Specification:
The protein is of the alpha+beta class and 271 residues long. The protein contains eight helices and eight strands. A five-stranded antiparallel sheet has the order 1-2-3-5-4. Strands 6-7-8 form a three-stranded antiparallel sheet. Helix 5 runs antiparallel to helix 7. The chain binds ligand QUF. Belongs to the protein kinase superfamily. Tyr protein kinase family. Ephrin receptor subfamily. It is found in: Cell membrane; Cell projection, Ruffle membrane; Cell projection, Lamellipodium membrane; Cell junction, Focal adhesion.
Amino acid sequence: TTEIHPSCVTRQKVIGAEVYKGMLKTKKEVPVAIKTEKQRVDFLGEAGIMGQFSHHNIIRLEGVISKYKPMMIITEYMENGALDKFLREKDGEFSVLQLVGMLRGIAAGMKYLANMNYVHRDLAARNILVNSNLVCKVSDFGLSRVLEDDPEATYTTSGGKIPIRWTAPEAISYRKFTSASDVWSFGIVMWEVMTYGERPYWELSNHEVMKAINDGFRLPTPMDCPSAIYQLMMQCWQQERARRPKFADIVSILDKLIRAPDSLKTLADFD
Ligand SMILES: Cc1ccc(C(=O)Nc2cc(C(F)(F)F)cc(C(F)(F)F)c2)cc1Nc1nc(-c2cccnc2)nc2c1cnn2C
């Protein structure tokens, strides 16, 4: 990671909550997002992992401020924010081609992480940021690791929490997290994109989802979804992780559909 010095940094507004919008001087200045004792340890820790990543579809770490207070993790800024909220907002305005391009981008980033032997564990549209060019980039806001136990509790959460509706069965039952379980999660993300941000298994409780998945049921087709796209998510949801596509097969399959777009034709796109 690169140590940024606080003079090139200007916080401006609180985006969420802390994560600010700011400006980073590079001459020209660029806009950035700024995230600000066990909590301090993990904070600087996560930056070290981010700094190892450099890919078009992975949130880019500009640097960190670890020698001054406030301590800061600085990334590029993603104007359009989190993909799930963004799709619920643009419900219907994108073609299948544009939606499958976002999925391609997401899979490209996930192929890069798998090549690094990095297992995400929380691949979900809420962790995908979007910029003014509709480029999608994998991120991790850390909600899986938010500590809500009492500081004197007899029993504490170990292993963090899992996103039950996004997590492969083997990872739920045996904590076997691999790129293959990320691929399952990627399938859920395809369904999220294609439904413009619907809640997976919206009619079911959490326990009913685990019971549904073990009975062989999966998310239903999205409306207006081309068959090839729904086929691919179904492949992502095979129960035996070894039969799922690799993130390389995925990027490849999406590339073939995009280059032969008649396979992405859905009547709603007809004019
Ligand atoms: C400043 C910052 C710091 C950290 C991360 C991040 O991705 N951490 C991360 C990623 C990975 C990995 F694998 F994906 F690369 C692995 C890990 C692990 F696991 F190691 F910890 C951690 C993201 C940002 N920036 C944003 N975040 C938010 C935001 C909004 C509400 C709540 N939280 C965050 N909004 C933003 C931006 C940019 N624009 N906007 C509108």
